[PDB]
Structures are given as structure tokens and as C-alpha cells.
Amino acid sequence: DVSALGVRGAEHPLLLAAVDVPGHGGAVFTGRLSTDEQPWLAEHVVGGRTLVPGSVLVDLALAAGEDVGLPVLEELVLQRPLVLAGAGALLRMSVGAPDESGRRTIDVHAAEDVADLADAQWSQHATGTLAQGVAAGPRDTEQWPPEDAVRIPLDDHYDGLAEQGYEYGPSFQALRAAWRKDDSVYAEVSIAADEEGYAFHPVLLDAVAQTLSLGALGEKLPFAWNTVTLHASGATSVRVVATPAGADAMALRVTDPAGHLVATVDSLVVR
Amino acid sequence: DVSALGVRGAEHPLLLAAVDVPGHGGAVFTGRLSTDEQPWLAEHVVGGRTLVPGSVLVDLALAAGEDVGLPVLEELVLQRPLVLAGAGALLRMSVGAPDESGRRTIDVHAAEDVADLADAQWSQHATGTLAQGVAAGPRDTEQWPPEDAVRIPLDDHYDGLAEQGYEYGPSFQALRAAWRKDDSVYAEVSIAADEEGYAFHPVLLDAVAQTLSLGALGEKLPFAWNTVTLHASGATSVRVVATPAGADAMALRVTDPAGHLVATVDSLVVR
Ligand SMILES: [Cl-]
Ligand SMILES: [Cl-]
């Protein structure tokens, strides 16, 4: 039925079809987001607007990279957040030709949902670069959290944020425990398993980025993700170490509860 | 159902879906050819092989240009003819980003038919450039054929060609009358109406190119089409004036029987 239209079907929960560009090895991906299909979308509200979390675009870009064979998100810069309008949103990712180094540009567009794709009013929401896979470090066997780390009490964490206009519903309240040492933050982050097929579940990935609120940073929204590497897919329960990385940024190291490396982010920048 | 997969449906008889690349204004088109659906494919046999006529790729490229908004085929260079293998063939056309002049590259690939598009063994069959539309000349009101033109008898034209290994079945025997003056050739060319939705019906367009066999050229296969402009779609009956255009090439001017301009080709080159 997908082959009947001459496209490939996409396994990612948010994607519908993929089409290769045979001459340059790129590809175009189409998908659709809506609160009906992904009710957790309704639980990320910022200043009164239902905003799609940037982590949705990061996970989709990782899925695109894995499909095209360039699985590292060397950079993704988020423009305007997607504002979810009851009607849902169409998504379109384009991966272009390789540069001399073998890297490719990826662009991400969205539009208000329409019946006929010719009518889609695309706007650009992100752009970045896909690159080659890198090896995983060794399993972490050190005490968790580290010896001198002290508990960060989380009791009114989400209440506090809500006051400030950042309203995370239970689906996004995924910081389960946290500790601090110097300006490093250690956290256990987990969601309930649901859809398979994400590269890194975007609710889980947003909650990984939430660790930045617990450090010297916490008093914006992430806007640039730099060197995102994925070593395991399908995680719903991870440990995160967030370390300072220059102004308005932290590096992230994400493992499973057994210490195996799951993902790294050289710097996540807020603005 | 097409919108369900996030693509646009294609009106061209050989195409299945189209997908825009919103960032650069290009697009990717997929389709499929087979003798079951287009029985005339079986009637173009060259040296014993069932070869898809180059005019199929030219018509598809014009359809792509019209869709993207660049309706002139500034050039199309045909590589290896597509050899039709009982299983049919998949087709894929990619239109890229505009150059500074606003022109775009178009690539055409084909593969043996497969159930899963991920398995498609694409090979490149043509590449060219799409450009901006140009105005039509005035209606031709001159005597047809011109006053001093003499009949070219056509009686064993197709028999002769068949001897030489070029076997055109009745569907392609579309040269209905021809005349010559100097090295110019005038011809009436027509097929029976069938599928709508072609930019220039590829059987009709191959028979337009057949006029090159009637002139000082006629004793190969066209391999480069230079500046193909379309002023009318849906023609099944045309008049053709073919004029010498340098070595191994002729220019073509194609009108309806009322003299209105339908198409021009600055040079069609054989090799
Ligand atoms: Cl494909
Ligand atoms: Cl589209």
C-alpha cells in the first residue's frame, strides 16, 4: 500500500513515509503530530501556549540520520517552537547531498494540517547537520550518584516551574531523583514505555534536557543541540550526568541503569 | 489516501506520488512503467530489446517542470535506454535547488520493480536542467506543406526500419504524411487519444522525433534534447517542421492542425 505510492513506510511513530533521492543519497520524510495521537503533546505548555518540545525535532532528526546512514546530529538549531493548534501539524524533514566530508544538511519544516499536501503552508522550524557515528565509551561502574553528591530535593520543582509559566503535566514530570556535586547534576529520568520506534523517546529526551534546570543554569528553553550521539535506542529509563559547558550550556552524558552509554550531547544551549 | 502518507498524488499517467522539498522548492516524483499498464511499451523494439523510448523521459521531465514551476526543459541528456524486463520498472525523478539564475537540475533514475522501495536498485538514466517558460510565436497561417515541398513516400518506411533492427509496432507508426523541401522535413503525426495527463504524449513525441529519419539524417536514437518548450498540453495530432541544426541534429517546430504552436525543440541530437 505504501509501495503502491512508490514510497517507503516509516517505522517512527510520528512519520508516515520516506522517499530517497537516489542521485545524492539524501531523502525526504513526512509525518504528522497531533494531541489525539500523542496526548502528551497537550502536557507541555509554556506561557499558555501548547508548544511542541524541541526534543521532538531532535528525535526526528536522529531517526532521519539513522535512516540515511549518518546517525550523529552534529548540530540542530531550533527556530520558532511549533505551536500546536487543535488541528495538529504536518512535519517534513529533508536531508540533502553530502559535502566533501560526507556530512549532510537536514532541514525541518512544519505546517498546519491540511487535506491536500499541495495546500501545506510550510514554515522552517529547525536546521542542522548529520554526520558519522562515533564509538561508545565503556560501561560506567562508579558509585551512583558519585560519593560526595548531595540530594537535590524535587518536591516543588514542577510547582515552581508552573508558577513561572512552564507547565509540565505528569507525562513530562520525568525527573525521578537528582543530586548535585559542584556544578554537575546527576538525575534518574524515566517515563512509562509506550510506542516503540522512537530513536530517543522525545518525552524522555525533554526530561534529560530538564536536568539543566537543576544546576547553576536554572534561573530557558533549549535552542541548539551540539553533537548528539546515540548508542542505544528504545530507552525509557536512563541516568543523566549534566556538566557545565560554557555560557548558557551543559554537556550531557546519558546511560542506562546498568551504566551502559545510551547517548551524549557535547553541549545543549539555552537562550 | 495519498494525503494519509503525507505525499501529493500525481496526475501524470506514469507517476504515483510527488513530494515537495520545502526548503529549496524542489521535489521528488515516483512512478512505474509496465507493458501491462502501457501496452505500447511492447511496440518499441530495437535490436531485439524492448527499449523504453527516450521521449518517455522527456515527457516525464516536462511534467516535473510544470509541477515545480519551471516548464522548459533547457536540456535533457539521455544515458542508457531503459530496458523493459517483464517485471516493469520503477521511475524516480528528483528536482533540486535553484541556481542563481533560477534554473534547477533534474535527475531521472529507474530500477527493476520491487515490492519494498528500500530494495530498489536505482540506476541513473537521464539528467538535465529545467528553466523558465518562454512565449509562443504566432499561429502559422502559411500553406501546408509549403508551396515547393514534395511528397516523401512513406510506404515501406517502417518495413525498412524493421530490417535495420528498429521495430516500431502500429502504436508507434505515427508518421501519417511527410514532405521535404531542401533539407527541411514537414510531417503530419498523430496517435489515437487515450490517457489524459501527459505533458506531451510520449508516443506522439517519439513520432515527432521520428521525423529526423526522413531528412539528410536518416542513415540513430536521440540522445540529447535541447530547449524543449511546451505551449499546449494534451495534443494527439500535430504538424512538425524539422530543420537542420548542425551535426547530427535538427530543430523541431510542432503545431496543431490549425497552426497554433504546441512545442519547440532547439535541437534534438542523435548519436
Ligand atoms: Cl524510497
Ligand atoms: Cl508535497
Curated annotation (Swiss-Prot), chains A, B:
Coiled coil stretches, renumbered: none
Domain PKS/mFAS DH: 12-271
Disruption phenotype: Cells lacking this gene are unable to produce 6-deoxyerythronolide (6-dEB), however a tetraketide lactone shunt is produced.
Residue ranges of the region described as N-terminal hotdog fold: 12-137
Region (Dehydratase): 12-271
Active site per database record: 44 (proton acceptor), 206 (proton donor)
Superkingdom: Bacteria
Renumbered residue ranges of the record's region C-terminal hotdog fold: 149-271
SS bond partners: none
Role this protein plays: Involved in the biosynthesis of antibiotic erythromycin via the biosynthesis of its aglycone precursor, 6-deoxyerythronolide B (6-dEB).
Something else known: Type I modular polyketide synthases (PKSs) catalyze the step-wise condensation of simple carboxylic acid derivatives. Organizationally, type I PKSs are arranged into modules, wherein each module is comprised of a set of catalytic activities that is responsible for a single elongation of the polyketide chain and the appropriate reductive processing of the beta-keto functionality. A minimal elongation module contains an acyl transferase (AT) domain, an acyl-carrier protein (ACP) domain, and a ketosynthase (KS) domain. C2-type beta-ketoacyl reductase 1 is unable to bind NADP and seems to act as a racemase.
Subunit structure: Homodimer. Erythronolide synthase is composed of EryAI, EryAII and EryAIII multimodular (2 modules) polypeptides each coding for a functional synthase subunit which participates in 2 of the six FAS-like elongation steps required for formation of the polyketide. Module 1, 2, 3, 4, 5, and 6 participating in biosynthesis steps 1, 2, 3, 4, 5, and 6, respectively.
Name of the protein: Erythronolide synthase EryA2
Species, as recorded: Saccharopolyspora erythraea (Streptomyces erythraeus)
First-to-last residue of the parent protein present: 2366 to 2640 of 3567
